[PDB]
């Protein structure tokens, strides 16, 4: 996690955190309202199944520096959202959990 | 395959459907346009931006180059252009992505 760039986040993001494994552990209503799911058929499920990436992408390759991802979250619904992830990192540089950022394309600015 | 995809909070973006039509555009994108909302929606994202001739759809999965195009007339705007596809699970396409990039952009 060298650049802030992939953390860059604005209050109508989803978010999403997970432990050591990748299993949410902390999900925003945002996020919930974006994915049309609820708070309990997401915790403790991995993030990467939730996020219908779990055949294209591993968790191995969440790099220290990530770009975004357009992700079509719910057809049924028409959002897009440019998906940032990164890894959560303590003092000495080890992978304790992963983030999840979910930018709406149409989200506002100042 | 997931493209990665660089992006900017300022940059513009635009999102189509499987024939190229826009469904979605961010204000950003209209702003470095110069276009309105009713006249971008539902029409080519090739034709709004000019490329008719010297790109296709068909380029876009394989392609890799980000192109510079003039966008905004008496206001002259340049923008880098990245085309990407929308994929979900299945691994079919349901559209394709236009990010703006201003050139002057930080
Ligand atoms: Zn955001
Ligand atoms: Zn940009």
Redesign the interface.
Known sequence: KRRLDSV?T?MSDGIIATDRRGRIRIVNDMALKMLGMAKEDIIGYYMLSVL??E???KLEEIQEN???????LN?EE?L?A?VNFSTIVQETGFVTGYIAVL?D?????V
């Open positions: 860059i604005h219908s990436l055949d294209e992408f990530n770009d975004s991802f357009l992700l079509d057809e028409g897009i440019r930018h394309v149409t989200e506002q600015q």
